[PDB]
DNA sequence: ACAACCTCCTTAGTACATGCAACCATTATCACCGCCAGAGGTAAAATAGTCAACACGCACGGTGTTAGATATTTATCCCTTGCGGTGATAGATT
């Protein structure tokens, strides 16, 4: 906390507009268009995996939707039970534990 | 009316070329502290969720048996050795 002034006030690191870069005027297709690059790897392995689990593992933050919903809309496209509908997007750390599976997303830190 | 000339005045314009090795400090200097911003904090409820319960249900891995492969053993076979007999080479001539 006294760093704060340290790490940038003796003669500024490149940090673009400090972190806030990320969600500044930026966001045009200037930056989306690796958002809609990974986007488009998660969206290819999320519809080869388990014809029912295959849903779940996109809500909550923002994943796959430009609405990235909550049950409503979602529990109508998946059908018979419930809120599997949110606990399959953790579940993957147990038998999706092959750490082969992430072999096609991992490039969006990189173009 | 000027002209440059005698003398030592000072000014200041430059100082050849190729390459390798090293590490990146010194300052002080009241920033006061007053105000209040939107803005930090967090309580209570939106965007929605945890993981414990009791169920559910499955994969994986280790113990066991089986399989067959492999490396050994054996023994066969061929390709090679070294010497020898005498080869037509090397090359000079026709």
Redesign the pocket.
């Known amino acids: 906390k006294i760093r704060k002034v340290l790490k940038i006030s003796m003669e500024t690191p490149i940090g673009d507009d400090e972190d806030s870069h990320l969600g500044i005027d930026f966001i045009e297709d200037t930056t989306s268009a690796t958002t809609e690059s990974l986007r488009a790897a998660t969206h290819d392995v999320l519809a080869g995996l388990t014809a029912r689990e295959a849903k779940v593992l996109r ?4 994943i796959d939707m430009n609405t ?4 409503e809309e979602v529990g109508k496209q998946f059908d018979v039970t419930r ?1 599997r ?3 399959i ?2 579940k993957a750390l147990r ?1 999706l ?1 092959h750490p082969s599976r992430s072999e096609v997303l991992r490039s969006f830190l990189d173009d």
């Open positions: 809500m909550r933050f923002g990235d919903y909550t049950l809120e509908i949110r606990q997007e953790a038998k534990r």
